[PDB]
Every structure is written in structure tokens, then in C-alpha cells.
Amino acid sequence: VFPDLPEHQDNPSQLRLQHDGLATDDKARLEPMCLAEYLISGPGGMDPDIEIDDDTYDECREVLSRILEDAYTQSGTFRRLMNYAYDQELHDVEQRWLLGAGENFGTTVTDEDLESSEGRKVIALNLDDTSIPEYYESNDGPQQFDTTRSFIHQVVHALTHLQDKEDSNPRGPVVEYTNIILKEMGHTSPPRIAYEFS
Amino acid sequence: SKVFPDLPEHQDNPSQLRLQHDGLATDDKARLEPMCLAEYLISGPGGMDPDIEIDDDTYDECREVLSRILEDAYTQSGTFRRLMNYAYDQELHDVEQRWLLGAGENFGTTVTDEDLESSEGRKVIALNLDDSIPEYYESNDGPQQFDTTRSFIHQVVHALTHLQDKEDSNPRGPVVEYTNIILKEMGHTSPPRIAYEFS
Ligand SMILES: [Cl-]
Ligand SMILES: [Cl-]
Ligand SMILES: [Zn+2]
Ligand SMILES: [Zn+2]
């Protein structure tokens, strides 16, 4: 059993606890500076014919690299997910993810999602923060998404291949992983208590 | 047409293919992460003959020493940066165009169409950390034996530039001269290599 938060203690995510059984190596063994390269092969979107602007891909990749750097050094929970993902996939170069810079937040983890992406692994990010914001439910009321939480959320999708909807849990394993990590990073935003907004 | 630093040993009959390459790779600024240069350059283990597989433990030993050499070269040598950066824009940013590391095998790099014909069209860079006669090179201070720093850099310059050692009207070739320039910028004591083959 690994660290958790008080907001998860009643009805913890079983799929997260199932995954904690697999990813047990919480030691820092990968170069924080190269986590972006281990994760991403190059630019790529959900639809293959649609090309990604080179300059946006560079803007997302650089901020991403810094978030992976901060997350890996401060959060033991994140290292376990990263380290395990390296043994299974990311050490192999052909099994890395495409970065859909500029496109809508999402990660191809479902058999349907891969059928929609021509069987291509994509993780779409954007910096539409500098518009209508997205909000999430907290014990302190709705809070706006910061790019740290948005990015981490989609990354946890990629490292774990888990989805947000979980039977009998209001958050799902990805949100809980995201919550655990951001707190270990010293992130102030309050935890997300439910996947769906009201 | 902006000539870059050279060595006193090259000014008479400088390598034209090196100076021709200096015109293309002109960005000497440090923009890549030195710690990840090995990842940009090498995808994984792989040898000259495809059926021959590489020992897992040896590949790790070469890749680790390599990573440290590229780190040293990239941070200290501007000439190396121009070659590394230029190689990144053209090929290594693309993941399918990266090199295989033939750890343990004899020093060599597939840069000629013939070399590729022998490797079934696979890009490989063979290194080793290995009785027989040691290897020596020509210097103004007499024969010198190769250190792994020079051996690795030499083969890497083959990969970054796709140039070969054989040059008409030059005794060294562009790869050797690049290697000499770089090792001096890295503060390497060994004397420059004045000729490819002994004369
Ligand atoms: Cl989502
Ligand atoms: Cl050679
Ligand atoms: Zn999600
Ligand atoms: Zn050579």
C-alpha cells in the first residue's frame, strides 16, 4: 500500500490500488531532463493526415518537459508510474507517444480511441490558458484547471493506460493519481473530489 | 562562407569537405540537453549483421561511457555543437532516422551506400571497450595509441556528418580534422592526428 490522500480514504479507487500492485519502484533512476524524449517520439495528432504546427509542438514539449522534471523529482508516486512505464513500453522507441500539440486534451487509451486514431498512440495538449476555463469539483467548490493539472492528468492516462470512468468510484484512478502527485509536488490547488462537474 | 576555428596542423591543405560542411552546420549554440544526446543519437542496440544480436550488458557499458563523452563534447566544443545540432534538424529529431549501437563490435559506422548494402540498410555505429597489436595514429610527436575518447568521437563524426575518411588531395580527411578540432576544444592532451594512414 502506497501513500494516499484523506479525500480518497472512503471508497478508494480500486483500479489505482490494482495498479499500485504493479508499479512498486518509487526510486529516481531516470534522467529528469530526458523524460519528455522517453515519452514522446515526435509531433502527431488524433487524425493522421492533420499535421501539427512545428512551433506549437515546441511550445508544448518544452513546458511538458519542465512538468515531467518537477513531477519526477518531487513526487514518488509519479516516479512509480514513470519507471513502470519505462520497463513495459518506453524503453522501446517504437512504442512511444505522439504529442498532439494544440489539439483538445485527450489520450488514446481505449480500443475505440485507437481505432479512431488509426491505431496510433497520441497525447493531445494545448496552452489555451493565456477564454472559457474548465472547472473541476472540490470540497472548496469549483476550481479552474491549471496547466500542471491538465498536463499531469493526460500523462497519467498514458503511463497507466487507465480511463477516468470507474464503477462505484466518483473520481476514477487517473484523477486520484493526479491528486496524489500534485500534492507531492507542493501544488496548492485543492484535490478534485469528482470526475463529473455540477 | 564563414570559416570556423581550425588547428595549426590543418592550415596547409585544409580539408575541403570539412570546410564545405562548415557552411551547412553553422549553429554553434548549446540548445540540446547534453544528458539526452545519446538518446537523440541511438535508438537501441544493433550490430553490422542484423542476425547477430548484441549482449544486453555490453550495450549498457558502451552507451553509458558514450553518454558521458557526448556530454563533455557538447558542453565544451562549439565545433561539436554545430555538428550535433545540424544532425538533429536533418535526421535525429526524427525517431526512425536514429542509429543502432553495435556495442562490442569493431569500430565502424555505416555511411556509404556500400556499407548500408552490407548492413541490410540499417544505420549502425559500432563501438567497443576492449592479444593483438594496438592501434596507432600519426602525430607530429610520433605514433600515438588511440584512447576511447578519440575512438568514439571519430565514429560519431562519421554519423553526424555522413562523411568518410577517404579524401582526394587531403592526407587526413574531414572526419579526422573535425575530431582533432573537437578533442582540442575538449582540452584533450593527445597530439593531433596529422594523417589517416601512416606515411
Ligand atoms: Cl479528459
Ligand atoms: Cl575508421
Ligand atoms: Zn481524463
Ligand atoms: Zn573513420
In whole angstroms, give the CA distance from residue B79 to residue B21: 11
Interchain CB contacts (distance < 8 Å): A and B: 23
- Amino acid letter, residue A126: N
To the nearest 10°, report the CA torsion of B84, B88, B94, B100. Answer: -10
Count CB neighbours of B90 within 10 A.
14
Interface of B with A in 75-94 (CB under 8 A): 93-94
Q: Give the domain extent around B5.
A: 1-199
Cα–Cα distances (Å) from B170 to B78, B82, B152, B195, in that order, read 24, 22, 22, 9
Cell triple for A73 = 523529482
CA distance B98 to A36: 17
> Are A122 and A109 contacting, i.e. CB atoms less than 8 angstroms apart?
no
Q: A-chain residues within 8 Å CB-CB of B33? A: 33-34
Taking the centre of ligand 4 as the mean of its atom positions, its distance from the CA of residue B183, in whole angstroms, is 15
Cα nearest neighbour of B33 on chain A = A33
C-alpha cell at B155: 565514429
Cα gap A98→A67, rounded to integer Å: 17
Q: Phi/psi zone of residue B142: left (φ > 0), alpha (ψ -120 to 50 degrees), beta?
A: left
Resolution of the experimentally solved model in angstroms: 2.6
Which of A10, A127, A25 has the alpha carbon at shortest distance from A67?
A127
DSSP secondary-structure letter at B89?
I
DSSP string, A62-113: HHHHHHHHHHHHH-HHHHHHHHHHIIIIITSSTTPEEEEETS-SEE--SHHH
B36–chain A Cβ distance below 8 A for any pair = yes
- Which cell goes with B162? 555522413
- The alpha carbon of residue B77 is apart from the nearest alpha carbon of chain A, in Å, by 21
In the block, which residue shows the cell 610520433?
Answer: B142
Helix (H, G, I), strand (E, B) or coil at A197: coil
Q: How was this structure determined?
A: X-ray
Least Cα separation, residue B35 to chain A (angstroms)? 7
Nearest ligand, CA B166:
4
Q: How many domains are contained in chain A?
A: 1
